[PDB]
């Protein structure tokens, strides 16, 4: 059709920060995760490298996409698609050229795709406070993030879904470990510790003779990939404003809906979740000043100057939201 050529044209931007991911969700028939993952796998030659049969890739991607909730405004398949594509661009940065194996690239991108699957649109703390089945199963520790990993790996077992069927045993074992390490690190309560280790690596940075970042050991390697996917997760305020604003609209609907459940249950309402006492603009500014900018400023230092434009957009968007109060 012609509609698929409009999508093919939009998928030419897959290597650019600020891809119009909502448009790709429209043109793909609510399949952004599938088409962006497929496009990225092609672009990085991962199907040939890992002997992934193309029909197995599509079947798994669609089943994965299916297990994101379409009735959750933020933590859905579009967010998933966005984090995948943002990680993809972050992998491409000059300061990281030829740093990561094809297996590590594969783990980072797969982790990003599964990283929020079957998110119910409420927080870990809500799930703990309400004595949810999820919290009971995972003993109040990385409750959502454990669940995303369990669902993401378990779907590889569905008919014609094992996109890793042609990896060696040791490649599967290494990848499984790296993916778990990555997604468990997206637990928001780990951000401070994650950023502290990132600062320390920035303060003791070492580059090779090609001016490219030097990582001697699994600990440093996995930690860079953990922060990379965490940054991609918290990248909405680094995007062009017309994108950023829709992500704000979507997170506040989710947060407001959680607050209405907290309120009905007699609970104290979570930060930013009270629709009767909200301050969306001041919260975005606060969230950038205390969380997103300290994080992205540190990442920008790690890959300096590759990330300068991304950080400038972040600063402009913070200025814009500030100007509305
Ligand atoms: C309880 O702690 C807080 C928090 O406290 C209140 C607060 C207020 C002002 C402050 F300055 C400091 C704290 C405020 C938060 O505000 C948010 C706003 C967001 C997005 C968020 O989701 C994370 C992104 C991806 C994903 O969840 O998948 C959050 C949070 O998760 C979040 C958290 C937890 C996250 C930590 C790192 C600690 C996503 C999209 C956009 C960018 C549009 O706006
Ligand atoms: Mg998450
Ligand atoms: Zn996320």
Curated annotation (Swiss-Prot):
Mg(2+) binds at residue 116. Long isoforms that share a conserved PKA phosphorylation site in the N-terminus are activated by PKA through phosphorylation. Isoform 3 and isoform 7 are activated by phosphorylation (in vitro), but not isoform 6. Sumoylation of long isoforms by PIAS4 augments their activation by PKA phosphorylation and represses their inhibition by ERK phosphorylation. Expressed in colonic epithelial cells (at protein level). Widespread; most abundant in skeletal muscle. GO terms for biological process: adrenergic receptor signaling pathway; cAMP catabolic process; cAMP-mediated signaling; cellular response to cAMP; cellular response to epinephrine stimulus; establishment of endothelial barrier; negative regulation of adenylate cyclase-activating G protein-coupled receptor signaling pathway; negative regulation of heart contraction. The active site is at residue 75. Changing residue 140 to R: Abolishes homodimerization. GO terms for molecular function: 3',5'-cyclic-AMP phosphodiesterase activity; 3',5'-cyclic-GMP phosphodiesterase activity; 3',5'-cyclic-nucleotide phosphodiesterase activity; ATPase binding; beta-2 adrenergic receptor binding; calcium channel regulator activity; cAMP binding; enzyme binding. GO terms for cellular component: apical plasma membrane; calcium channel complex; centrosome; cilium; cytosol; membrane; nuclear membrane; nucleoplasm. It comes from the Eukaryota. Changing residue 116 to N: Decreased 3',5'-cyclic-AMP phosphodiesterase activity. Loss of Mg2(+)-binding. AMP binds at residues 75, 116, 233, 236, 284, 287. Residues 1-325 form the PDEase domain. Mn(2+) binds at residue 116. Zn(2+) 2 binds at residue 116. Changing residue 176 to D: Abolishes homodimerization. 3',5'-cyclic AMP binds at residues 75, 284, 287. It is found in: Apical cell membrane; Cytoplasm; Membrane; Cytoplasm, Cytoskeleton. Belongs to the cyclic nucleotide phosphodiesterase family. PDE4 subfamily. Homodimer for the long isoforms. Isoforms with truncated N-termini are monomeric. Isoform 3 is part of a ternary complex containing PRKAR2A, PRKAR2B and AKAP9. Interacts with PDE4DIP. Identified in a complex composed of RYR1, PDE4D, PKA, FKBP1A and protein phosphatase 1 (PP1). Isoform 5, isoform N3 and isoform 12 bind RACK1 via their unique N-terminus. Binds ARRB2. Interacts (via N-terminal region) with SHANK2 (via proline-rich region); the interaction is increased in a PKA-dependent manner. It is linked to Genetic variations in PDE4D might be associated with susceptibility to stroke. PubMed:17006457 states that association with stroke has to be considered with caution. Hydrolyzes the second messenger cAMP, which is a key regulator of many important physiological processes. This is 3',5'-cyclic-AMP phosphodiesterase 4D. It comes from Homo sapiens (Human). The gene is PDE4D. The chain holds residues 388 to 712 of 809 of the full protein.
């Amino acid at each position: 059709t012609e509609q698929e050529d409009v999508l093919a044209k939009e998928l030419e931007d897959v290597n650019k920060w600020g891809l119009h991911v909502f448009r790709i969700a429209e043109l793909s028939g609510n399949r952004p995760l599938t088409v962006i993952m497929h496009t990225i796998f092609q672009e990085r030659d991962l199907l040939k490298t890992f002997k992934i049969p193309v029909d197995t890739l599509i079947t798994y991607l669609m089943t994965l996409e299916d297990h994101y909730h379409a009735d959750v405004a933020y933590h859905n398949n579009i967010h998933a698609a966005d984090v995948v594509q943002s990680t993809h661009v972050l992998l491409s940065t000059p300061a990281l050229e030829a740093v990561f194996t094809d297996l590590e690239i594969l783990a980072a991108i797969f982790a990003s795709a599964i990283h929020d699957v079957d998110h119910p649109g409420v927080s870990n703390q809500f799930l703990i406070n309400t004595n949810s089945e999820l919290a009971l199963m995972y003993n109040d520790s990385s409750v959502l993030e454990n669940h995303h990993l369990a669902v993401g790996f378990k779907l590889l077992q569905e008919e014609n879904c094992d996109i890793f069927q042609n990896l060696t045993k040791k490649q599967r074992q290494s990848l499984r470990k790296m993916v778990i390490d990555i997604v468990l690190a997206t637990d928001m309560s780990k951000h401070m510790n994650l950023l502290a280790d990132l600062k320390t690596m920035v303060e003791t940075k070492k580059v090779t003779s090609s001016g490219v970042l030097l990582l001697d050991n699994y600990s440093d390697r996995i930690q860079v990939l953990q922060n990379m996917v965490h940054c991609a997760d918290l990248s909405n305020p680094t995007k062009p404003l017309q994108l950023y604003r829709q992500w704000t609209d979507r997170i506040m609907e989710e947060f407001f809906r959680q607050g209405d459940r907290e309120r009905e249950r007699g609970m104290e309402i979570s930060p930013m979740c009270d629709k009767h006492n909200a301050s969306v603009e001041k919260s975005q500014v606060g969230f950038i000043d205390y969380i997103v900018h300290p994080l992205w400023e540190t990442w920008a230092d790690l890959v300096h100057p590759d990330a300068q434009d991304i950080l400038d957009t972040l600063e402009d968007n913070r200025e814009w939201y500030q100007s509305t109060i």
